[PDB]
Amino acid sequence: RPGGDTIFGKIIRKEIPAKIIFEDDRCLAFHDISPQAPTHFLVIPKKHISQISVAEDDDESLLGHLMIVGKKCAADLGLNKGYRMVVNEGSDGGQSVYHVHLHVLGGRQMHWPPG
Amino acid sequence: GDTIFGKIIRKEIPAKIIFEDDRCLAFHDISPQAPTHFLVIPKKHISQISVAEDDDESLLGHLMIVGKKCAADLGLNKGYRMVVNEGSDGGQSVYHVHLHVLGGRQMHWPPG
Ligand SMILES: Nc1nc2c(ncn2[C@@H]2O[C@H](COC(=O)NCc3ccccc3)[C@@H](O)[C@H]2O)c(=O)[nH]1
Ligand SMILES: [Cl-]
């Protein structure tokens, strides 16, 4: 099954419901079920890549597309004071789902350090 | 307007450079928030991610690929966190797009 069987692969194939913000042939943006800010969504590739550390050189356009879609969705959601984009890698990064994903958080002041 | 990151790209002030190519520069953060904390920045002056153009897509992805390669070279085998801040709520400190890469300790949740 295209996208794999992580929760995110299931969401891509409409097998598990999600609150979808934007969808194209390359990616999907949807709200996080455990939000850490008043607005907290995810942008994921439809292609399954387990983690950023194994992304290939030719994935550059796709990874950049996640950011472009993320910033467009943030504007569409009225995050006019800004937002934070996060990619978690591995154990120290706090990655819990091994399908690459970009978090976008806003609607409150984000603090430093970022975790 | 120019920023301190422009000065770093132009080699006018020092930074501990990790990697450079024709289109980006990676260097250690002067105010590190983890045992390893570096930045990957485009040489093109994009002020913030909110104004990035569609044609910049692959350049933005290039920052992430460079970041992950630098992280491996710096020994971050247990993982790391990549961050882009936008605007005041995002805590963006310099108005030149930059990818933070942090590791060498457990990163926590929420991410700020
Ligand atoms: N809509 C929807 N979102 C989901 C679902 N199952 C998971 N998620 C979200 O995926 C993200 C994965 O994040 C990471 O990999 N690291 C962040 C993290 C997570 C836990 C503890 C510490 C850090 C998390 O923020 C989840 O809330 C789902 O069924 N539906
Ligand atoms: Cl910043």
Distance CA A82, CA A28 (A): 21
Interface test with B, best of A41, A50, A63, A73 (most B CBs within 10 A): A63
For chain A, strand residue ranges (E) read 20-23, 27-31, 39-45, 83-89, 102-106
10 Å Cβ neighbour count for A49?
19
Experiment used for this model: X-ray
CATH of the domain at B96: 3.30.428.10
**Domain count of the fold of chain A:** 1
Chain B residues within an 8 Å CB radius of A59: 61, 65
B33 is in an annotated binding site: no
Amino acid B20 reads: E
The verdict on B33 touching A (C-beta cutoff 8 Å) is: yes
> Do residues B81 and B37 make contact, with C-beta atoms less than 8 angstroms apart?
no
The verdict on B4 touching A (C-beta cutoff 8 Å) is: no
Angle in degrees, CA A61, A65, A70, rounded to 5: 160
Distance CA B53, CA B70 (A): 25
> Do residues A46 and A12 make contact, with C-beta atoms less than 8 angstroms apart?
yes
Nearest CB among B50, B72, B89 relative to A109 is that of: B89
Burial zone of A57 (CB within 10 Å; 0-12 exposed, 13-18 middle, 19+ buried): exposed
